[PDB]
Symmetry: C4
């Protein structure tokens, strides 16, 4: 095998088709499904898999009580077959910890997990299912990473980490790994003022990451990485179609180089595909809560501070719970272009459904079509009442 190179551009996105769905919470009502959160999807050359952070308990298990909590010693990055649920018996542990990323370089996979207490966390970088490098916290405040796949080019796999405050300036670093070793790292540059939970995709030798400015911004920061030069830029999505959550109502003009204000110290992981007129943004439908999900075609969102939607697709109704969302692509598919894909985490349980003591999720995932397909909505589908 050779290292994959990002040689193709994005396919034209005219709609989104269903790719995978695991129905995990429905199935886990009466089967040995692990409690998870922070899911994503990532492809190897011969298979695509679901990934997430386990909570080290099943959902009917008594240890599900307390699983609203993000960071414990009982979490691990797990992967499992596409559209199956994450069960005790089919889930492969990639590494231990409570913040992760993972990506295949064309030869093998790199997985990164961070663990530790808040003031003394460390990342372990695994390559070919063996630990290779470790990175200690630099700011002693919840060293943390993407929670979705990284992207590689000719073996170089950039990863974005943050360490420091979630409610003020933090120390974001872009590490460039190859075979699990650090080639270089850079501090964040550009005009993004705070970065968390980057969602990345690659095309024609450039990696684009759409992130969460938890501190100030209801527009999303965008990091664009050149994995050959190992350099990057940052800015915000300029569009007034604001895509964090919670957020204020949409303005008529957005901000390119600073956080669009109105909501502080909160957010949600999300994503976009930024490709000129072939630009699609995801967001929650609710401005207040992690409810609903929609895709909006917003031509030139990155650069046009008045850009508005020209097309859209509902993914999850506003009467159903959503969650984190992120990008992935199958870089090893046939054809002339890369097909944009994404997932949405469908969070069930706490805090919004507090008649149960757990928090878990299921996954829905879609990829782009060049057809203009009909739309359905894709809720989690479980009845909370059944768990009482």
């Amino acid at each position: 095998r050779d290292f994959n190179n990002l040689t193709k551009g994005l396919c034209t996105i005219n709609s989104w088709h269903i790719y995978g769905k695991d129905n995990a919470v429905r199935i886990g009502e009466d089967s040995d499904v692990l409690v998870t959160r922070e899911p994503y999807v990532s492809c190897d050359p011969d298979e695509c898999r679901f990934y997430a952070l386990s909570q080290g308990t099943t959902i009917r298990g008594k240890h599900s009580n307390g699983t609203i909590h993000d960071r414990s010693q009982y979490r691990a990055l797990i992967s499992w077959p596409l559209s199956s649920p994450p069960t005790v018996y089919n889930s492969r542990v990639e590494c231990i910890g409570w913040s992760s990323t993972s990506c295949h370089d064309g030869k093998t996979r790199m997985s990164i997990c961070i663990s530790g207490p808040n003031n003394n966390a460390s990342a372990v970088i695994w390559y070919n299912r063996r630990p290779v490098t470790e990175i200690n916290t630099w700011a002693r405040n919840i060293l943390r990473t993407q929670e979705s796949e990284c992207v590689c080019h000719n073996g170089v796999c950039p990863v974005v980490f943050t360490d420091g405050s979630a409610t003020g300036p933090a120390e974001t670093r872009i590490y460039y790994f190859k075979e699990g070793k650090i080639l270089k790292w850079e501090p964040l540059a550009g005009t993004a003022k705070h970065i968390e939970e980057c969602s990345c995709y690659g095309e024609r030798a450039e990696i684009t990451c759409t992130c969460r400015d938890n501190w100030q911004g209801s527009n999303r920061p965008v990091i664009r990485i050149d994995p050959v030069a190992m350099t990057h830029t940052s800015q915000y999505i300029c569009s007034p179609v604001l895509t964090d959550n919670p957020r204020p109502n949409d303005p008529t003009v957005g901000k390119c180089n600073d956080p669009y204000p109105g909501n502080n110290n909160n957010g949600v992981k999300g994503f976009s595909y930024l490709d000129g007129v072939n630009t699609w943004l995801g967001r929650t439908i609710s401005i207040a809560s992690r409810s609903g999900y929609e895709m909006l075609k917003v031509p030139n969102a990155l650069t046009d501070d008045k850009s508005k939607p020209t097309q859209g697709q509902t993914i999850v109704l506003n009467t159903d719970w959503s969650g984190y969302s992120g990008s992935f692509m199958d870089y090893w598919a046939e054809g002339e272009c890369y097909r944009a894909c994404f997932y949405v985490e469908l969070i069930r349980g706490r805090p919004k459904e507090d008649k149960v003591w757990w928090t878990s999720n299921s996954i829905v995932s879609m990829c782009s079509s060049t057809e203009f397909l009909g739309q359905w909505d894709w809720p989690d589908g479980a009845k909370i009442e059944y768990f009482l």
Copy 2:
């Protein structure tokens, strides 16, 4: 690997032997078996598997309530090892949706799933476990396909779809796929007046599909496809041995080019092998309900409007529930001829057994023998009382 070619004829069918049986409902009374319906069987060059549409819940799970319903966001095409039950832990999701087909071309497998609301459904065509093509509804009324395997010849895999009314003229199309791409499609031609749920098999470079005329016909429509020319014909089975369900009692003379009347707006998926004097038809034993199943040797059923049985085999007694049935063959077996095989879906639960709130099925499957073997009957075997 090369693409498989349909170079062989059918083996002489002198009786049927047991091939597979999953006992899913029996086993699922106390194990994590998924609720399914619309099962089938399909072979790869190195393995044969069971397939079905999951309902995204186990049968003891509380979400089994409601699973009489055909179309939800929680359904998927799954496959699993021959004669195992479809469990949470052993079932591989092929694609998401509520109407499917799947077939191996000798190189890899194509799977097709349709999802969406009734007025805005779309098919996704997967090849080599990746999405390749999508097709939007053309009639905005439950785009739907075979619910059993397709057949390929030199890479060309025809698939029959219908969109439109179930109780009047609809828009049936035969798509010819290769490597998941559309080579051509044709509207239905010939004298079949309504088509659903085609059951297909191939022999000497011709594909024969036996279908369901839900609107008018208690004889079954037959589509015969030339996958090289990519053309087809349609007619009905001429025989007065009527094989849909519900149906009127058998006449003495059938109809070749129009629906044999008496029952409207209903049916069941079924199949036949039409090979001159080596012709066998399956049907339910009951004329009124999906009860029993039998195979009848009906020489020249396709073309002889007075043909009657010369031999038969009971598969399921009329005191046991049946369901859909369909054809498959192992195109990669050794020997000089293709051995005809079929399955019967053994439906349990609603609507006929309404003391439970679910609907599920198990599978029995048989293939032909050149011996004249003794017959057994093959019920599902579960006791509904145990589920109360």
Copy 3:
């Protein structure tokens, strides 16, 4: 791969060491273990597996009620990894039916299952996991076979079948299969008067089968097969160490060419290794019930009508339940000789433990050592009280 040839002799048997044990009934008290009976062991070139006839239900499942019964539509030959229990999720179905054998020829595996009602049973012979040949009942009375592995030589795999009475003369046939096809079959010849449930092993181009004379004999019949000539002989084990069950107490002189009388119309499957002074016989310890199990070294048992034990090994105490026993070897092991192995089926439940409504078993298996090893006893280990 080439066909395996029986080129080696037996290793010297100086004691028996533990090979595998599945603890199935213990584990199945709280896990999804299938109800089984009639287990055995068989090796492929790269793996050894446990085999048995499933009852198509788990042991905690309500459908376990009734599983004392031998023949139903819900049985299948299953295999699973050595020393694991036979679970819903890890068990591979080989074929459907209620009497089986299976063996690897060095290239691939042949499996045979018989199904049907008592008066109309049929065998299906699978090779390379595909059905190849079928054989209809010839006597219309429970066509039945070995219930342990067959043995192959240069592709020729003899199998012993019986059809007819269990309590008087029956029609036993030795079929010689190659690639699942019938080369030849012979009726039983020699002086054995009734044959069931043969337990076979091969060495230096000869296959030895030790069987059950259910009608009259408490000595066991022995069939010796030349798989090159495709001919056989039969006789009884001459030794007065009688090894069927139930049986009379041991005499001082046995019978070579007729059944040793005293017990009629009953028996148990069992085995022996007959190799001159390297001869070991297994038997139940109890003369009355399937209780205990022991191995006795009985030099020249086959030919010496006064032969008595010179050494022994207790396998299962007489205060624990046993069951069927049979031979297998790993024909693909390293070294200069074939190591004799056997299993014992440890039957739990009905009829001897009738406070539960099921019948199931676990497996213990041992192979020979050239050391004189210490002995343990190997009970099933489950507490029936836990199942109430």
Copy 4:
């Protein structure tokens, strides 16, 4: 494949990073997890796995009652994927018995299990998943071995066994195996006075084993093996940092060539890495019970009878239960040096938690880093109250 050679030295150990954790007791509260104890970790060239001795029951199973007991017929050496729990469905049985070791030689794996009653135990040596050699008890008193991985060099895999008293002189033997055959064995030599449960690692053609002197010593005996010459030495760790349990408080000067006294007839399996100034010792934090676990950097512990810690890392708080600990390395990793790894068995249940009737464990495992990483603590994480 060629046999692995121990060509590399140890990596510099500046801290320990998380490697694996299975959360077995947490997950097994509501999933089919086997009861285990005596776990370890061992790598093949393409995978690392967890190993342990099953008790032949799940933890919620009623047969979990009594599993404080060390030796029964229902135990087996099992392996399963790294960081998964040992479940009924994912656990591979390596061999049957109640004392084990296992190691890969670069070509295939050798596994050794001992079974039998106390006065008549025997070891079976498996190679390439087949039994090859057997060894009968020589002292008729609980023949027993390492309970963690062995190490191979050019095919030669030394294993340490003991047979005899646990509370006075016993008969320890070092067997040198190749392809599962005995090349040689030696009686223990040197100044260690009692040996059990050796924990081994290899580097630059030498194997170092740190063991348990159950009889007298609260310092640990160390056996150093030359696998080319097939010779060994023994002594004790000289350091006054005493690392058995229970033990007296730490002195200022230890003992090189005799047991450091104060505690008799007890101990725990443990380990060390002895590499000059790159020397790390593990131990329980409690001097009295199997509570807590810590790593201490104790330069020249082996040879310096006043050596004290210069650095350390807490693995398990003293308010959490620990257990056995042992060494392993991935001899097939990339790079210039072998990375030291270890595990800790986190024992739950009896005798310390006697409100439940079972004894089981989970596993945490770590490997060395050349960074100075932040430390977390890694408890089992289960709530005993949930099991009542």
